[PDB]
Design a protein around this ligand. Structure first.
Ligand SMILES: CCc1cccc(N)n1
Ligand SMILES: CCc1cccc(N)n1
Lengths: 325, 325
């Protein structure tokens, strides 16, 4: 029912956007079908974790606070696709990084996907009292993500910033705010129960869940083989500020740091193996299990503090936490 | 006084954005100075025609409708820099088209410039009654521009679309709405006198002025030498849907069309000269003077219809039209 309703609202959103281009923007059918195929390619196929999180938060707050139910659930699906379209926009920008008309279309796709989040919100929420506050929180989180991207891209340009506090800064602004905090907040807005929650504990939980997700993703990027990871792990070659790098530098000897700095950030298949060997010899996979266990306890305890004043809201946070756990 | 006040509000806007990153987004000084230099490089140096147009429309509507004057003029400067930041955002995307970290920073610059239009609006207009309507009209025009870019990039992919009505469609959506209609509308919003104008004649005037500007720009791109044009004219090599191309195809013989199709869209220095020769032999520069004269008369007459009900508002439109004339 959740996934089925989510995909049913997707057809409604796509039909409005494409028909609007046909009726108001004077677009020809060849380009309307072109944009339909592009919208399906970039927005459909993932796991829809961000979008479905908005629905799970909304359905809990209406049963644990009747035509208002049907409207809130529909508003959550539109908010769910706002984030999915936003995530589609971010991924398109990633492909541009890694008279050329395909690059021209890629940039155009990114601009269109971002604009579509505004267009679908200005339409389905035209008479909602929260349209202005929803767009401001949405735009501020998008700005936060762009700032987080700047922290990540320049993590090796200005190993000084290879610290655990800067790693959390990258994770907080580039991933945690739009993946964990935003879907939870959007569920509170469509349920109108925004000021009834502790935003401090909620913001704190969103950062810890994103941090837990990123550390696990960093270790899998280095040790999980490509066919089991779904991609080629490239953090070492790209010299990323991963959890493995900042944890190695704190417990390595003065020589192992020199051997790390001489082997990190290279495409040589053996230097990457030299970095993996250094990670192995430091028992980082053992430190990984302990570091994640401590984060998980901070998550388990913070959900209880949020349950005291927002009982039903914490049930969805545990469901969201289970997807990462 | 107009330019001096405009640059004075620029320092105020930049200081707020950078300090916000320092105080709220936990940004280090090295990156704050990096973003200051980037903001100056992309937003400063142009002619500020879009930004100053908002000021000229605002100052006319307050004298020809007193602490409200100082607020409206300041609100117009913020709106003026919203468009300049938006134009900076579009130009950055143009450079991307024509582990690489400079391309990564270019994409990041484009996302930051667009977000800054929202951030400066959500701050300086936080208590303005038009904040929601300003962001919706701003976002819809931005979406329009992205649609216009799609019409332009695909003008030769799907010479079928090389028609005069499709040329106006490209000019209307890609240039006219955000360069001519948006600065005029933003001047009406900060002056609160939006519903006191004929939006039909205003929209019609904005499209004609953009069309007049684009035709003149197309002819100069082909005939004005590089040192006098400020750039290398590349419309023929890029096979653009220029006014010269769609006018040639309507008055050329069946063979000249074949010679045009065989020479258009190539980088060969002689095929480009063959296309220029075909443009010369068709007296297109003579048709250019006549076509622009007819557009100018439509502009002169439409400003009079707008003066009947909006007298002071038409004075700024004539000033904006003079910059293109
Ligand atoms: C465009 C850079 C970016 C930011 C956030 C997420 C993501 N995948 N990519
Ligand atoms: C990014 C494509 C574009 C659109 C409008 C104007 C401009 N210069 N560039």
């Amino acid at each position: 029912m959740p996934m089925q309703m989510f995909m049913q609202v997707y057809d409604e959103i796509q039909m409005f956007l494409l028909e609007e281009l046909e009726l108001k923007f004077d677009m020809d059918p060849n380009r309307v079908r072109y944009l339909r195929k592009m919208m399906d390619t970039t927005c459909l196929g993932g796991k829809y974790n961000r979008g479905l999180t908005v629905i799970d938060v909304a359905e809990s707050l209406l049963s644990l606070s009747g035509a208002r139910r049907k409207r809130v659930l529909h508003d959550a699906c539109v908010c769910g696709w706002m984030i999915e379209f936003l995530q589609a926009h971010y991924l398109v920008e990633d492909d541009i990084m890694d008279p050329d008309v395909t690059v021209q279309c890629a940039i155009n796709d990114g601009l269109l996907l971002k604009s579509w989040t505004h267009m679908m919100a200005m339409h389905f929420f035209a008479d909602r009292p929260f349209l202005q506050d929803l767009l401001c929180r949405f735009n501020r989180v998008d700005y936060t993500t762009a700032v987080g991207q700047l922290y990540d891209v320049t993590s090796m340009f200005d190993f000084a910033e290879f610290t655990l506090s800067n790693y959390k800064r990258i994770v907080k602004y580039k991933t945690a705010y739009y993946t964990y905090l935003l879907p939870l907040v959007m569920g509170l807005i469509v349920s109108e129960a925004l000021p009834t929650v502790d935003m401090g504990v909620t913001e704190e939980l969103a950062m810890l869940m994103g941090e837990y997700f990123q550390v696990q993703d960093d270790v899998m990027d280095c040790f999980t083989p490509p066919e089991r990871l779904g991609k080629v792990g490239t953090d070492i070659q790209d010299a990323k500020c991963s959890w493995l790098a900042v944890t190695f530098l704190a417990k390595a000897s003065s020589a192992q740091v020199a051997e790390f700095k001489a082997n990190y950030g290279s495409g040589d298949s053996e230097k990457v193996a030299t970095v993996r060997r250094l990670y192995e010899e430091a028992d980082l996979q053992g430190d990984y299990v302990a570091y994640e266990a401590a984060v998980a306890e901070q998550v388990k305890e913070l959900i209880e503090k949020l349950r005291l004043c927002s009982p039903g809201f914490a049930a969805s946070v545990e469901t969201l936490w289970g997807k990462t756990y």
